[PDB]
């Protein structure tokens, strides 16, 4: 069925997107959440852990580990504001500027290898109509 085919392509497109993340995750040995945090940090600049929590869904039991790991991979570092102590500010580690460019270029590659298929899927999805 043509309508049914198009609707089912929602799942195909979702799969494309999760696959791209899978590719990044395996190459860079990071979690989905870590990748999203790094991207958000690059988009919005340094911020507190609490603030980042609003942009990226990190479940409480993996939170400490997630940020601690980003620190150990040397992607970020932490700062303690001198009049809050229980607030943690995170910053991109500029020493890893070249690695940042490399990662973004890899993500670009993974997107490019999927771009035609994703648009073809979205075309099928959007082509779904009433009957």
Query: What residue ranges bind a second copy (CB under 8 A)?
Result: 1, 3-5, 7-8, 10-11, 13-14, 17-18, 20-21, 36, 39-40, 42-43, 101, 104-105, 107-109, 111-112, 115, 118-119, 122, 125-126, 128-131
Nearer to Cl ion, 49 or 122 (CB): 49
Q: Please report whether residue 50 would count as binding Cl ion according to CB under 5 A.
A: yes
Nearer to Cl ion, 27 or 79 (CB): 79
| Residues 6 or more apart in contact with residue 88 via CB below 8 angstroms | 48, 49, 67, 78, 79, 80
In the bound complex, what is the minimum distance in angstroms from residue 50's beta carbon to Cl ion? Answer: 4
- Rounded Cα gap, residues 49 and 62, in angstroms: 13
Q: How far is CA 9 from CA 31, 33, 88, in A?
A: 26, 25, 42
- Rounded Cα gap, residues 73 and 62, in angstroms: 16
Q: Please report whether residue 88 would count as binding Cl ion according to CB under 5 A.
A: yes
Q: Which two tokens stand for residue 58?
A: 């990190």
111 binds, among Cl ion, a second copy, none (CB under 5 to 8 A by kind): a second copy
In the bound complex, what is the minimum distance in angstroms from residue 101's beta carbon to a second copy? Answer: 6
- Rounded Cα gap, residues 116 and 130, in angstroms: 26
- Contact region with Cl ion (CB under 5 A), list: 52-60, 85-93, 106-114, 116-124: 85-93
| Residues 6 or more apart in contact with residue 111 via CB below 8 angstroms | 20
| Binding-site ranges for Cl ion (CB under 5 A) | 48-50, 87-88
């Amino acid at each position: 069925n043509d309508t049914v085919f198009g609707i089912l392509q929602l799942e195909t497109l979702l799969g494309d997107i999760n696959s791209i993340f899978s590719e990044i995750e395996s190459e860079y040995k990071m979690s989905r959440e870590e990748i999203l945090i790094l991207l958000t940090l690059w988009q919005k600049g340094s911020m507190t852990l609490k603030e980042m929590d609003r942009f990226v869904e990190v479940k409480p039991y993996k939170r400490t580990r997630t940020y601690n790991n980003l620190v150990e991979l040397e992607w970020i570092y932490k700062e303690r504001p001198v009049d809050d102590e229980r607030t943690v500010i995170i910053h991109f580690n500029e020493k890893l500027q070249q690695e940042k460019v490399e990662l973004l270029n890899f993500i670009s590659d993974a997107i490019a290898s999927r771009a035609t298929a994703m648009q073809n899927s979205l075309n099928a999805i959007i082509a779904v109509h009433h009957h």
